[PDB]
A and B are shown apart, each in its own frame.
Chain A
Amino acid sequence: GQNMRVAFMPWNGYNFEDSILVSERVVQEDRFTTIHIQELACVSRDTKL
């Protein structure tokens, strides 16, 4: 994970039930930007034609 400076307090219903109000520094600093490598295939078959 990443240890971030969290404050426990309600702050405006933006964490109503379980939600989590993340700040923009979390998204600028790229401390959750995570790389996913995906594999796409393309096969050439032998149609009857």
Chain B
Amino acid sequence: DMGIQVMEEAPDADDLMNTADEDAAEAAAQVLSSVESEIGRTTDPVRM
């Protein structure tokens, strides 16, 4: 969501095309740094 897109292999080798700007970057980094602080899940109603 903030970049960078996780393809499953080596490519982007010679594809030099940046829609990932910009306020989403620090917020998404915050959310990622927080996901370790928890263990989940709060996303499946069934499991909750």
Direct contact of A and B (CB under 8 A): no
Q: Contact residues of A with B, CB < 8 Å?
A: none
Q: What is B's interface to A at a CB cutoff of 8 Å?
A: none
